[PDB]
Amino acid sequence: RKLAHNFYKPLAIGAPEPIRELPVRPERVVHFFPPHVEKIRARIPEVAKQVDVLCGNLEDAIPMDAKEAARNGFIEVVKATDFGDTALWVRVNALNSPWVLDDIAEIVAAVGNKLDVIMIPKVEGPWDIHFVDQYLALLEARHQIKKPILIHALLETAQGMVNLEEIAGASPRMHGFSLGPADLAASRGMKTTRVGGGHPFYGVLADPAERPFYQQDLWHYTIARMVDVAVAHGLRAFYGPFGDIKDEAACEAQFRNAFLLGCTGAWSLAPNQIPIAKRVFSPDVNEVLFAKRILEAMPDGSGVAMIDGKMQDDATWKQAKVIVDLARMIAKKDPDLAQAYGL
Amino acid sequence: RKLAHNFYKPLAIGAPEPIRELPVRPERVVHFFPPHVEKIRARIPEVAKQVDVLCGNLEDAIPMDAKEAARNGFIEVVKATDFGDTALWVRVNALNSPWVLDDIAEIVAAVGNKLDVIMIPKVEGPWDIHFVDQYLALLEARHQIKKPILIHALLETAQGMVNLEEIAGASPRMHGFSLGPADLAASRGMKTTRVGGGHPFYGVLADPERPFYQQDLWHYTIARMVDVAVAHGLRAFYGPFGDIKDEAACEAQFRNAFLLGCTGAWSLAPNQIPIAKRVFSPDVNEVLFAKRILEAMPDGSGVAMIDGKMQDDATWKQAKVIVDLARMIAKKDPDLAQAYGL
Amino acid sequence: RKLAHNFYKPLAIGAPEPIRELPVRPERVVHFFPPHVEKIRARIPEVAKQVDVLCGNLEDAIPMDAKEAARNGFIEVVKATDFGDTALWVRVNALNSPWVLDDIAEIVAAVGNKLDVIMIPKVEGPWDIHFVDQYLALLEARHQIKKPILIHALLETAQGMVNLEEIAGASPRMHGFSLGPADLAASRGMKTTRVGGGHPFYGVLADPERPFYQQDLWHYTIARMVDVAVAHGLRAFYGPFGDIKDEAACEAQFRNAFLLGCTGAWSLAPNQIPIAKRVFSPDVNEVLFAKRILEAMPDGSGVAMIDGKMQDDATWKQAKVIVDLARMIAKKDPDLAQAYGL
Amino acid sequence: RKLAHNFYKPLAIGAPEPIRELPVRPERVVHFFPPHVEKIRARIPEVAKQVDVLCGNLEDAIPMDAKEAARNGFIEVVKATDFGDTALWVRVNALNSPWVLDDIAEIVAAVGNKLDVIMIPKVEGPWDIHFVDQYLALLEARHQIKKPILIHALLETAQGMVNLEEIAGASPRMHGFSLGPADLAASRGMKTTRVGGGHPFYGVLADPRPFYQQDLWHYTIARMVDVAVAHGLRAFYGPFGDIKDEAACEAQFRNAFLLGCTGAWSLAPNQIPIAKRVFSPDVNEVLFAKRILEAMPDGSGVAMIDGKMQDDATWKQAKVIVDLARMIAKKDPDLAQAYGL
Amino acid sequence: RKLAHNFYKPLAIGAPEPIRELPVRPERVVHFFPPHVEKIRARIPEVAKQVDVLCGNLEDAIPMDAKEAARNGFIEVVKATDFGDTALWVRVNALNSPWVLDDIAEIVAAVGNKLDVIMIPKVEGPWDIHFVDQYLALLEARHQIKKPILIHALLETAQGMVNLEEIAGASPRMHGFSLGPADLAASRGMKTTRVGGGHPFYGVLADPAERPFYQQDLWHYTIARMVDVAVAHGLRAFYGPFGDIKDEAACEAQFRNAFLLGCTGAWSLAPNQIPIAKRVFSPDVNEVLFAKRILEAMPDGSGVAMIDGKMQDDATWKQAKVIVDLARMIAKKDPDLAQAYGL
């Protein structure tokens, strides 16, 4: 628990000033891609135009022999690509791995000024954050990175869920969390199906034709807790990978459940999940219109105002301010939503 | 959190001795009324006889040009009304609002001896409780209030849910928590259809037509609220249900709270009044069992075993609570009086 | 918490060295038996062969006038029986009862080397663990117990759930947790139709006859229990299911706990024995995947990758546990032996 | 720490109700004695009249073959002695020792209604207190002890000094702390020439040479007092080993007293009057407190004495120091007139 | 402790923005005066010209029948006086007294825009700070106070010393601490012969004519602990009152002991203590001359510099900046120190 007057200081001389609040931009879909596959690298400038954020993958589904080819491939394609409004993330290897050191160092050195958020696997405590925060700062100051590279934590273990508060407030670099269904289920010892997301035998048997069996959601406690901790710290919650690429119905349903609980976006591991994520995690229409009324009653966000019998202040205003700014950005690339939002 | 030998001490010279445990009384329904409306104000003495708890509202749905009127209005009825066995609460404005200072100060000064619980909107940390505690204490001393005015925390933000333990044990004034569904959903970013309800699209899709089983949005919230509240000797409450017209959903939602361990719920309309009282009335067989406990242990001392279960002091005090509670309800409900035998 | 270098030191001179990790063995079923009953006592050596864990009961459903005969009767049967591969547990009385002192002391004194785990009722805080840990150490050093006796915490209060993390990391004696549904629901104010069951009136009403989707009362509880236990290297157990004859609902409830990460459940009758064993037997596909991890990394060192997932120390020793557990079960079950390939 | 509404409840059924405040009584001197020595046991009924607190010792300086004799001898003399106004303490063996179980269990069983305070050696954390608290409660309930036996923590390790706040607020049984100089110095690696004393070579050298000796125990005692007082506990100076050096003994006792310590141990009859003389309540403080008790008849309302507002916390301490002075006045005629009680 | 992103927010709509760093100004002497006394009240414009800080007293040594007179007297003299460079404090009554509410409310209402710091007696925990913080914010918003009024905690109990960390980080209003010797000694059970002084009989007796008796300082632990907690949280530590007015020798020695341990200033209960405090707690000439070179080496305050073998960063530059500003302000009032400092 750092002191407030030390929390927002750069951890290295020449490192960029830590952020006071998260950058507002579309993050409905976190599209993953293997940077070592040449065919994939070829289409990256085209796919970048269809997604909110594009994320390079050096960890899972990346063979041990391809680790360096992935890192170099990532650096290669990023140097050549103008991502424009699409954000750039990268998931490096775990902190105990023999690749993570070169992963962060070589990438920040080469394409640090294009990198927005870095994803760290298997974050189990604030000590993990402390290392990465200090490590990035020294790398940022070294190569004159102009904007602080944010930290996205991947929740994969039982300990991670327990230490969620301490992780959330360990650094001003914190961006948010991603629920890793397959990894977390393996850690906890959950028996799920279809690489994480449910099990048809988890339900309630009714009292006595045949007794009704009402399936229940295995991930209620997990997401609910993830949202509360994240929101309280001004961070965003995300549903991670939905491994069952072919079941688009279960995918959209699972994505929707996350959205209804307060999640910002989800991962896509294939071209068919891109439109699903962008559709589900798009800001509610009525919610956008309501926030426009709030911004109109309060030009500065100063003073006291009441809308629909509800007192307004700086908190509700900044909040209305982010969702309108967000919706406007989405409207800029979606004529159909530009009409529905009036933005 | 304060030291044990300082926790139950008055925060002001003249302030009444803090309570050691919650006053036992019916709290199945907390009826909200707008004190600035003379028409509604005039019916208060008769409504009070219909509800367990009556709560004046100065906050939401009370216009900014009517705050002073709502405040002065509330003082007016309370001065002129004898509430009898009905508890008197009031929901003042937010701690950052330009109304809260005069709200608490003037109401305590005028009717502090009739006010039981004050409800604080948007409690997010123990620092909120600490302010209200010290502020009330100085006010109680100035006007010689005989009973300590308790504090009810309204949960409306994510931080409030996370800091629930710190809030619960921040003061001996703590009464309990009310879930503010609409406000909490807005804070978290929950997508919900109507206040107090859930969402039709939250559910589990069955494996490869595929059935769709709706889920409860508020399960985690109520469960955590109950656990924290009970552990600190407080009481958990379900807040407002915005759909007055839909009584079936209202009873179903109130029942979900009751089954998880909530004490009562809010009522915004007269049709919600009998619903809350019916749902949150103490379980009959549970009451009947506590009567055996109180009898096996008249003094409440020594060791006793009922149905193979050992009875210590903790279970006895719990049994004393529900039996007394059931009796105060049986006092004005001939049917429950029959079932309880009280 | 204690410092790391002190955490694994014995609390008494002559007390066995504290374990660094849980002893791996079948714990799918915890069969309870009243040691004061003679006809039950006689059939014990036979019942022991049919269960993974046999637990003597001195607490609930044991009359106060039979407490001593239960304690003595337990010592008698344990003395004359070689339980073999069956784990031996005992549930003593509550830490505030007038029996617990003689319970722990006399049992450890006589059969301490045959006792594996002691179940403590109503653990509410780390202080409870601290007493038993220090108490046991003094008793172990006195009678030269070679194996450290582990503590199994019974969760029966809301405060216990709130302090679950402090309880989990209070001692290396910690084995795991078991839910006490009848008590935990009483403490919370939860309404259940069965001990360890749910409630048919708890569910989501659909928007406009309106269908009613039942929900699980225990989702929050089990989920929190699992995360805390697993994080501290402990095992979470479901506990008892009241409705003995509802084997259908018994299996479903046991299954839900298993799917969430619970190691096993209690059995209150012979018919619940095969149900618990069937349900909590290690998932076939976890066993298979674990063997691939072990086959890939002989000594557990170095870096490897299975199905795209990097394997480290944590994954390896976790896989070592599963296979060892599956092998111990394969030994006494030919069907699972072929399914596991062990 | 436990929750406030649970903190003051008996930890066993039939156990006496936990105290809310420390019992007010003279504790200027804690006189130790070896209960196994029959010659000492014979004079105890008379020695008790000469000390504020009498504490039997089962731990240090008690041979391993005499541990059982000491425990039985203690029970024997306590049964035979009417202690009157003299407090009865006992220092059992360490919590890891093979004697502590029998020490606490058998003594409480036989003379639990005469035992006021147990001194526990080498208390390092709240866990130590949690065990003793729960263990005592079950023993108290079983033998129907009428008053809760308090716990006095011995500070003998660096860890104990670090976990002071956590040890203090871990139980309502907590009476206070005694400093254990020899063992604490050994734990820290501190160099002292005497048990309870400092070191002549610890000091400040002047600039170009006089050498100004410093007190090694300043930090330790100051920290102990703050933590104890904050929790409503009493801090004590432990044993002073150098029996013959009465000048240095009084100086060490006085240093502790000036910092806020309640009393000190006595390892020999000659230290008994020294502790009394030093740790007797200041006359001026007693007289000023009498003014408070007179100005505020019930302790309510708001008064002001010498330009200082008197609430309830100030009045409660005025009441404590006066009651304490009166009890001492009951057996010291010189202070009876000095205090005016 | 609050989260960093909520820590620096107004606690009320209309309340001024909380400070990020302590205002830099001469605080060597905090001169106490009784506002209920007429002749004192009439010389205030003259005395204020001779002190760094002027603090009105409503608490100790103020009779109960004079509480209202003192409160009104303070308000009247502040309204009529332009204090210029002199800071204005006030010590209201204890938080449990029947005078606190009126003390704070009426003063903020009438002279809130002239009040710099408010001193609270007997601060024992963060909860105390929490009340005053919120109370002030609601009063500041109501009366349009432009600058936030800071909180100065008086240490008078053993509990206060123990909870010193939680107190220091309880609010951005925190200015620092003052040691209250008579009250704290009474709480602890200490014995002193003078208010603020030690005790002759507290010392080390040398080994075996006469055995020498080396006197020891009673307040070493207290001041040392107070300084570490204060400095860590970016606060300032003050000695407080030295009750022995006559003994100027002991007063200066006692003030110096605080100054050598890092205390910013002390109270002056009498006109003869004013020049003593100003002389003692004036910034050391060596620190000013050296800290200037730091600013000289690195003007903007960034980059990597090295002075006398020691690396200079943001932390050291910021501390060097304040010591020169402080010295320059003092230079404006003292031509001797203006010569020594060179400012």
- Supply the CATH number for residue B155's domain: 3.20.20.60
C118: Cα separation from own chain's centroid: 10
Chain D residues within an 8 Å CB radius of C125: 2
Contact C130 D135 (CB under 8 A): no
Our CA-based measurement puts residue E332 at a distance from the nearest CA of chain D, in whole angstroms, of 36
Cβ contact C135–D138 (<8 Å): no
Cβ contacts of C135 on chain D, cutoff 8 Å: 131, 135
How close, in Å, is residue C102 to chain A by CA atoms? Answer: 37
Q: Does E217 touch chain A (CB under 8 A)?
A: no
Tell me how far apart the alpha carbons of residues B104 and A192 are, in angstroms, rounded to a whole number: 53
Among positive and negative, which fits the CA dihedral E154, E156, E161, E162?
Answer: negative
Rounded to the nearest angstrom, the minimum Cα separation between B221 and chain C is 9
Q: Is D55 left (phi over 0), alpha (psi -120 to 50) or beta?
A: beta
Q: Classify C148 as helix, strand or coil.
A: coil
C20 burial type by CB count under 10 A (0-12 exposed, 13-18 middle, 19+ buried):
exposed
Q: Which chain C residues touch D162 with a CB distance below 8 Å? A: none
Tell me whether strands B304-306 and C304-306 are parallel, antiparallel or unpaired. unpaired
Q: Does A93 touch chain C (CB under 8 A)?
A: yes
Contact between chains at D254 and E201 (C-beta distance less than 8 A):
yes
Distances A93 to A9, A98, A149, A153, C315 between C-alpha atoms, Å:
27, 8, 17, 12, 16
Strands C150-155, C117-120: pairing is parallel
- Rounded-to-integer distance, Cα D242 and Cα C237, Å: 59
**Cα–Cα distance measured from residue E113 to residue E135, given in angstroms and rounded to the nearest whole number:** 16
Tokens of A68: 């360096």
- Interchain proximity C165–A162, CB inside 8 Å: yes
* CB neighbour class for C12 (10 Å; exposed up to 12, middle 13-18, buried from 19): buried
Question: Which of D172, D230, D311 comes nearest B13 by C-beta?
Answer: D311
Strand order in the sheet with E150-155: E236-238, E174-179, E150-155, E117-120, E87-91, E53-57, E29-33, E266-268
Report C:5-24 residues touching D (Cβ under 8 A): 6, 10-14
CA-CA-CA-CA torsion sign (A313, A316, A318, A320): negative
CA distances from D198 to B274, D182, D195, D235, D249 (A): 77, 11, 8, 19, 11
Answer whether B touches A (≥3 Cβ pairs < 8 Å). Answer: yes
Work out how many domains chain A is built from and give that number.
Answer: 1
What six digits make up the tokens of E50? 């001779």
How many whole angstroms from its chain centre is CA A179? 9
**Amino acid identity for residue A255 in this structure:** F
Tell me whether C182 touches chain A (CB under 8 Å).
no
Instruction: Find the DSSP H helices in D100-151.
Output: 100-111, 126-143
**Ordered alpha helix ranges (H), chain C:** 4-7, 38-42, 44-47, 67-80, 100-111, 126-142, 158-162, 164-168, 181-188, 219-231, 247-260, 272-280, 284-296, 313-330, 334-340
CB neighbour list of residue C234: distance below 8 Å, 6 or more residues apart: C22, C168, C174, C175, C176, C177, C228
Cβ neighbours around A268 below 10 Å, total: 27
The secondary structure of A105-135 as a DSSP string is HHHHHHHTTT--EEEESS--SHHHHHHHHHH
Q: How many CB atoms within 10 Å of residue E336?
A: 9
* Cα separation values, A220 from A181, B224, B325, D294, E5, Å: 12, 13, 34, 65, 28
Place of tokens 């800091």: B163
For B105, phi then psi, to 5°, come to: -60, -45
Q: Which of C118, C115, C184, C173 is nearest to C143 (CA)?
A: C115
Measure the CA–CA gap between C241 and B221, rounded to whole angstroms: 26
Task: Quote the DSSP letter at residue C254.
Answer: H
Cα gap D78→D88, rounded to integer Å: 9
DSSP string spanning E261-276? Answer: TT--BEEESSGGGHHH
Residue found under tokens 């000013």: E288
C183 annotated to a ligand binding site:
yes
* Nearest-neighbour CA in chain B from C36: distance (Å): 14
C39 belongs to an annotated ligand binding site: yes
Helices assigned H by DSSP within chain D: 4-7, 38-41, 44-47, 67-80, 100-111, 126-143, 158-162, 164-168, 181-188, 218-230, 246-259, 271-279, 283-295, 313-329, 333-339
A101–C contact, CB cutoff 8 A = no
Round to whole Å and give the CA distance between E216 and E200: 8
Q: Compute the distance between CA of residue D92 and CA of residue D58 in angstroms, rounded to an integer.
A: 5
How far is Cα D326 from Cα E112, in angstroms, rounded to an integer? Answer: 51
Amino acid, single-letter form, for residue C86: T
Element spanning B236, H or E: strand B235-238
| B60: contact with A, CB 8 A cutoff | yes
Beta carbons of C202 and B249 less than 8 Å apart: no
Strands D174-179 and E29-33 come out as unpaired
Q: Two tokens at E235?
A: 């606060």
Neighbours of chain B (3+ CB pairs under 8 A): A, C, D, E
Q: For residue A53, give the 3-state DSSP assignment.
A: strand
Helix axes A220-232, B181-188, angle to 10 degrees: 80
Residues 6 or more apart whose CB falls under 8 angstroms from that of E329 comprise E24, E25, E26, E85
How many angstroms separate the CA atoms of E160 and E94, rounded? 14
Separation between Cα atoms, residue E42 and residue E46, nearest integer Å: 9
Helix crossing, D100-111 with D126-143: angle to 10°?
Answer: 40
Write the CB contacts of C160 (distance below 8 Å, at least 6 apart in sequence). Answer: C122, C123, C124, C125, C153, C167, C184
Burial D87-115 (b: 16+ CB within 10 A, else e): bbbbbbbbbbbbbbbbbbbbbbebbbeeb
In degrees and rounded to multiples of 5, residue A29 shows phi and psi of -135, 125
Q: What is the dihedral of CA C150, C155, C156, C158, to 10 degrees?
A: 140
Given a contact cutoff of 8 angstroms between Cβ atoms, the answer to whether B161 and B190 are in contact is no
Establish if B321 touches chain D: CB-CB under 8 angstroms. Answer: no
CA distance D255 to D130: 32
C-beta atoms surrounding B31 within 10 Å: 25
> Given CB atoms, is E95 within the 8 Å cutoff of chain B?
yes
- The token duo for A20 is 């006071």
- Which ranges in chain E belong to alpha helices (H)? 4-7, 38-41, 44-47, 67-80, 100-111, 126-142, 158-162, 164-168, 181-188, 220-232, 248-260, 274-280, 285-297, 314-331, 335-341
Cβ <8 Å between C189 and B220 = no
| Tokens linked to B57 | 């509202």
Does A61 contact chain C (CB < 8 Å)?
yes
C-alpha to C-alpha distance for B272 and B33, rounded to whole angstroms: 13
The bridge status of strand A310-312 relative to strand A305-307 is antiparallel
Spell out a b/e string for B227-251, using b for 16 or more CB atoms within 10 Å of the CB, else e. bbbbbbbbbbbbbbbbbeebeebbb
For residues D133 and D68, what is the distance between their CA atoms, to the nearest angstrom? 23
Tell the residue number behind the tokens 């031996």, with chain if given: C88
D220 to chain C, closest Cα gap in Å = 22
Q: Specify the 3-state DSSP secondary structure of E155.
A: strand
C1 touches chain D (CB under 8 A): no
Distances (CA, A) of D59 to D32, D94, D189: 11, 8, 22
Q: Report chain B's terminal Cα–Cα distance, integer Å.
A: 40
E161, E187, E205 ranked by CB distance to D248: nearest: E205
Binding site as annotated, residues of E for substrate: 31-32, 39, 91, 182-183, 269
- C-alpha closest to that of D177 among D191, D163, D187, D190: D163
Could you tell me if residue E62 is left (phi over 0), alpha (psi between -120 and 50 degrees) or otherwise beta?
A: beta
Q: How many CA atoms lie within 13 A of D26 on its CB side?
A: 27
- CA dist A328 and A337 (Å) reads 9
Instruction: Name which of C108, C138, C139, C161 to mutate to probe chain D: the one with the most chain D Cβ atoms within 10 A of its Cβ.
Output: C138
Distance in Å, alpha carbon of C219 to nearest chain A alpha carbon: 7
Q: Which residues of chain C have a CB within 8 Å of the CB of A61? A: 308
Distance (Å, whole) CA C326 – CA C28? 11
CA distance E79 to chain D (A): 27
What chain A residue is nearest to B183 in terms of C-alpha separation? A310
Could you tell me the two tokens for D303?
Answer: 């008064």
Task: Give helix A285-297 / helix A314-331 axis angle, nearest 10°.
Answer: 130
Most A CBs within 10 A among E8, E13, E138, hence the mutation to make, goes to: E13
Contact C92, C59 (CB under 8 A): yes
Instruction: Give the whole-angstrom CA distance, residue D29 versus residue D31.
Output: 6
What residues pair up with B214 in beta bridges, in sequence order?
Answer: B203
- Residue in B with minimal Cα distance to A262: B189
Long-range contact list for B61-69, CB < 8 A, 24+ apart?
Answer: B61/A309, B61/B34, B62/A309, B62/B34, B62/B36, B63/A306, B63/A309, B64/A304, B64/A306, B64/A311, B66/B36, B67/B93, B67/B99, B68/B102, B69/B36
Rg of chain E over Cα atoms, rounded to whole angstroms, equals: 21
Domain extent for E99: 1-343
Task: State the count of interchain CB pairs (< 8 A) between B and E.
Answer: 78
**Which of A187, B80, B8 shows the shortest CA–CA distance to D8?**
B8
Subunit partners of chain A (3 or more CB pairs within 8 A): B, C, E
How many angstroms separate the CA atoms of A270 and A245, rounded?
A: 7
A205 within 8 A of A182, measured Cβ to Cβ: no
Largest CA distance in chain B: 71
Q: Rounded to an integer, what distance in angstroms lies between the CA atom of residue E93 and that of residue E103?
A: 7
E10 contacts A8? CB cut-off 8 A? no
Distance between CA atoms of C184 and C254, rounded to whole angstroms?
18
Cβ-contact C230, C236 below 8 angstroms: yes
Vertex D13, ends C117 and C137: CA angle to 5°? 30
Interface test with B, best of C65, C205, C218 (most B CBs within 10 A): C205
Neighbours of E72 (CB within 10 A): 14
| Residue type at A120 in one-letter notation | I
Measured CA to CA, the distance from residue E219 to residue E196 in angstroms comes to 9
Q: D231 to each of B166, D147, E25, E160, E168, how far by Cα in Å?
A: 21, 21, 38, 12, 20
Long-range own/partner contacts, residues C71-75 (CB < 8 A, 24 or more apart): C71/C35, C71/C99, C71/C102, C71/C103, C71/C106, C71/C107, C73/C35, C73/C36, C73/C37, C73/C38, C73/C41, C74/C35, C74/C107, C75/C106, C75/C107, C75/C110, C75/C111
Place of tokens 């008994």: D272
**Contact C305/A at CB under 8 A:** yes
Cβ count near E37 (within 10 Å) = 14
Q: Are strands C29-33 and B309-311 parallel, antiparallel or unpaired?
A: unpaired
Rounded (10°) CA dihedral B203, B204, B206, B211: -10
What is the C-alpha separation between A331 and C252, in angstroms, rounded? 48
The bridge status of strand C53-57 relative to strand C29-33 is parallel
Write the Ramachandran bin of A189: left for phi over 0, alpha for psi from -120 to 50, otherwise beta: left
The rounded distance, in Å, linking the Cα atoms of B96 and B78 is 26
For the record, the structure tokens of D160 come out as 């104990």
Of B322, B309, B321, the residue nearest B283 (C-alpha): B322
CA D132/CA A167 separation, integer angstroms:
37
Residue by residue, DSSP assigns C67-133 as HHHHHHHHHHHHHH---TTSEEEEE---TTSSSHHHHHHHHHHHHTTT--EEEETT--SHHHHHHHH
C131 at D interface, C-beta within 8 A: yes
C146: left (phi over 0), alpha (psi -120 to 50) or beta: alpha
CA E4 to chain A, closest CA, distance in angstroms equals 5
List the single residue in A10, A232, A304 with the smallest CB-CB distance to E13: A304
Per DSSP, E11 falls in state S
**Structural contact between residues E177 and E235, judged by C-beta atoms closer than 8 angstroms:** yes
Instruction: Taking each helix axis as running N to C, give the angle between helix D283-295 and helix D313-329, from 0 to 180 degrees, rounded to the nearest 10.
Output: 120
Residue C70 token pair: 């239960």
Furthest-apart CA atoms within chain E: distance in Å: 74
CA nearest neighbour of D172 among D27, D2, D320? D2
Q: What Å distances lie between residue D41 and A247, D71, D269, E46, CA to CA? A: 87, 12, 15, 76
Contact A46, A84 (CB under 8 A): no
Going by C-alpha positions, the residue among A60, A64, A74 that lies closest to residue A104 is A74
Instruction: Provide the 3-class DSSP secondary structure of residue D240.
Output: coil
Its sign, for the CA torsion B48, B49, B50, B52, is positive
Distance CA C316, CA A148 (A): 36
Are the C-beta atoms of E29 and E278 separated by less than 8 Å? yes
